[PDB]
């Protein structure tokens, strides 16, 4: 029984921006979730649609680990039925979501004196993101009647803005690393199981 490589997702050196959130499929393995929900490193550990203890006792056809970085006061937005720039234009969870959301402060790694601007998020979009949708268009958005030709202008805007991650920022504006585990069960044979 080869163990599920959760350390690859959780202990990654670099994390992706929320608009370009990374997805890793976890399959054909046994996952010990006790080492996750016991750890005090996580500021947020909330499971929707399934209890943390039963995670070990259940098998699932596919497991998805979505990883990204946001700022503190936005961690609440990774939850079904949430509204906001992250949930509307960057990363949206469905109403029938089944899985868990884990978030931990990463100021010691993702913040730099003078500002860390490697982490971006989408400000504008014509329509709200569908659940589990990724947008990397980085095209010049239009918010006015005047048309545009990929040229920044009066009503032509770049759709992406970078977080200013500095160690002196407040907790709400400090970088938090977020991993979302999605446990989905199809007619396909089960691949990921826990102990028992």
């Amino acid at each position, epitope marked *: 029984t080869n163990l599920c490589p959760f350390g690859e997702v959780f202990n990654a050196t670099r994390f992706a921006s929320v608009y370009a959130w990374n997805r890793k499929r976890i399959s054909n393995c046994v996952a010990d979730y006790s080492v996750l929900y016991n750890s005090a490193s996580f500021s947020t550990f909330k499971c929707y*649609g399934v*209890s943390p203890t039963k995670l070990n006792d259940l098998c699932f056809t596919n497991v998805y680990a979505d990883s990204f970085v946001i700022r503190g006061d936005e961690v609440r937005q990774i939850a079904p*039925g949430q509204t906001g720039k992250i949930a509307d234009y960057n990363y949206k969870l469905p*109403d029938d979501f089944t899985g868990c959301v884990i978030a931990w402060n990463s100021n010691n790694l993702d913040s730099k004196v003078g500002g860390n601007y490697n982490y971006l998020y989408r400000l504008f979009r014509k329509s709200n993101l569908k659940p589990f949708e990724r947008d990397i268009s980085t095209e010049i958005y239009q918010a006015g009647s005047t048309p545009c030709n990929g040229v920044e202008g009066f009503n032509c805007y770049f759709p992406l803005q970078s977080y200013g991650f500095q160690p002196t920022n407040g907790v709400g504006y400090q970088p938090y690393r977020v991993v979302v585990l999605s446990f989905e069960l199809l007619h396909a044979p089960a691949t990921v199981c826990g102990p028992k």
Partner: antibody
Amino acid sequence: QSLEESGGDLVKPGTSLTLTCTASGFSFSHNYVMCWVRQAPGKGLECVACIYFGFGDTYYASWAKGRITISKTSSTTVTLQMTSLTAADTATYFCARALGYYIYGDAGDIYIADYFKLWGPGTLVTVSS
Amino acid sequence: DIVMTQTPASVEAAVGGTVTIKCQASQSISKYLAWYQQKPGQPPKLLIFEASTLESGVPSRFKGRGSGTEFTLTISDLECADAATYYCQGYYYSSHSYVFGGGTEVVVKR
């Protein structure tokens, strides 16, 4: 992302009325909890009944003794039925949405549905002759 | 079984002042306490959840503090539009019950 209520009207004492909370922009999935909150004219808010879509069960207020029945009619509709209507039931009725989730603790696993972010405009129920 | 005692029934302060509303739970509710603003003829509007977390779009002059059986909502830099009724709602996970406070009215002194 919307909650619209209907069914309020003048009803004679001792009758029974059903109220309907309609969801718009979202589904009544297993992650949500619906509660009916009632406030009398010039008085505070009280929770009447709650439905837990995740478990398929319900919770009712202490002052209610079988007089309240809250049911899920559709994926976007929830009904509240009240019997033996008295003057103390004369009030405005809101349906509120709460997000339920699991956390781990020393007792074990805990289901939390702590606050109501989304409310409806409400409907007024008047019980008099 | 759980009571939320909210006091005083009315708080007053001039524009730019600070009002404090106290809410005491009969038994410990951990951090699960919420504050709601209500204007007449309107649904309650959520201000604070988890007893200290500001809802997005709510100004920072609304601050919730406390835990266990004692909570406070402080409104500094009072504006004229702050005149409304404010409620505290506790959640007891053991009984899955939602208890609302009596309510407090904010009066803008002038």
